[PDB]
């Protein structure tokens, strides 16, 4: 920023080799932070090829205002992609960051997966409605910035992110506004005056975003760029996933998963303390016994 | 009644033939209400007999809210009366919708648990607690918070003050600050007047996640005090039981669609301009992949 200019909201950046407490401090202060090279170079390539057939079989709606107008969405990444199920979801850093946002000492893994979405904003797609992802859990806004974190997003780029192909518009620091509202002219005072920043990103980068950060896919201005992303939506264990992964992901794949990844997809329980109780358990036991996964 | 005797809080009681609006009005005022005859005596007695082998095989722990209390949750597997008729209580669904379901979204609730709770002779009293402490952030929203959880807590065997009927605190869903009930955080600690849910078999009380309560002390030598807790949460919250993974598909196929939704064999659509199936499969109902039409 040239001297005397207005400084736009800060969007720090870290290489995927940086410390967890470091990237977390940026997450805490600004609600978001980029992690360049979150997934390896060829890894993202091997992922993008693997889901390209499934993407290719998704028609595009040309409608209207909603978040599906010229935007393809696809969630069966575990089924359709070995690289994702074998490599990406086993990022030690990802878990290291989920432990800081969600887990409490002695209570095990405090988080699990909400969704695994590939989102490909088609050329000419209108800008997505501005929103907090925690609107998925409607009461959460009511708790304001003091509320605990329900949701974080590792929002990784598949094809590159530019200002023109509709990369995500971020509003850093909107996690600390004093009243969390929906973002429209009737409910949001600051509507029309919201300073957004685009998340310019190369394939394999990601931004870790809080469910409190206002954001949205921008308008894709191009004519050939299908702007593709991979969203790793991770929630606290007490919240329900939008994807019923433990009913769609075949048991064969769950047997190949780690313990922690079995916990992420609901093939394994976790114990909550208050008295104690396995959430998503089976009459006082881990659901994994009944599924043939303890041995 | 009593003789200038201090009068205890009133737990309102309605027969199961009362209008769901009259029971919901009581529930809103007090946070709890008794539904007499929520289940028929014939239904209760078949249920109790159908789970009873499973109850006998459960070792009593003697030493914590599991102290001399049996807790059994495979009600759907062990009991046809449960899955074929207790689950199909229309008054239960009337009341659940009035609490949880939003306009134009389908069912906004599902099952958290189906727990048989048999308080043994001599079992000590349970700590005072709100059931929404299961979702730890919920107390922070206070009494203006939305409902997260309700309990249809049914007497399977009689509930008496001696054998440990639940102690309830009506209107504790309206206190300005929702706190955990200990000496550090709860200013009223020790000073809280509870009342027991005196119930006959098949009766039940409907209770908010926001009401303070605990199982009473079982001061008898003979009464094993058996209850059935139908714990119902809203659709965005995680169940304590993984029913869709343990309940067999053969039993899912025989369920009504609203029962399939209760146990996670079927999705429900939430609206935010946008629409998403909660607990879905790549934009489609999970009931498709499961073969439930
Ligand atoms: C761990 C416990 C938790 C936190 C949650 C409950 C809870 C899921 C709360 C909601 C209810 O609708 C119902 C009946 C389904 C219970 C069953 C018993 C447990 C699982 C619990 C327990 O089993 O304690 C050894 C408790 O007794 C208790 C009361 O103290 C708790 O509040
Ligand atoms: C219905 C929608 C909901 C309500 C919820 C999200 C949500 C599950 C929220 C949490 C995120 O981590 C992520 C990326 C996984 C998305 C995926 C897209 C949808 C499912 C949604 C959508 O697909 O719109 C027809 C939207 O785009 C949106 C933003 O507008 C919504 O708020
Ligand atoms: O497509 C994008 O860039 C953002 C996706 C998103 O924010 C959502 O669907 O919740
Ligand atoms: O068994 C009772 O009467 C009380 C049980 C209860 O409130 C609980 O475990 O949450
Ligand atoms: Fe979003
Ligand atoms: Fe309770």
Author numbering:
A (entry chain B): -1 to 61, 63 to 273, 276 to 296
B (entry chain A): -2 to 0, 2 to 61, 65 to 273, 275 to 295
Authors' own words:
To understand the structural basis for the expanded catalytic functions of the PrhA mutants, we also solved the X-ray crystal structures of PrhA-V150L/A232S mutant in complex with Fe(II), αKG, and its substrate (3, 5, 6, or 7) at 2.25–2.3 Å resolution, as well as PrhA-V150L/A232S/M241V mutant in complex with Fe(II), αKG, and 3 at 2.35 Å resolution. Encouraged by the production of further oxidized compounds by the PrhA-V150L/A232S mutant, a third M241V mutation was installed to generate the PrhA triple mutant. PrhA-V150L/A232S/M241V mutant also catalyzes the same rearrangement reaction as AusE and generates 13 as well as two additional products 15 and 16. Thus, the PrhA double mutant is capable of catalyzing additional oxidation step, and the triple mutant further oxidizes 13 to 16 and 14 to 15 compared to the wild-type AusE. In contrast, the activity PrhA-V150L/A232S/M241V mutant was almost identical to that of the wild-type AusE. In the reaction of the PrhA mutants and 3, hydrogen atom abstraction occurs competitively at C-3 or C-5 to yield 4 or 8, respectively. In the complex structures of PrhA-V150L/A232S and PrhA-V150L/A232S/M241V with berkeleyone A, both H-3 and H-5 are well oriented to react with the reactive ferry intermediate. Moreover, the M241V mutation is thought to provide additional space around C-13 to allow further oxidation to generate 13–16.
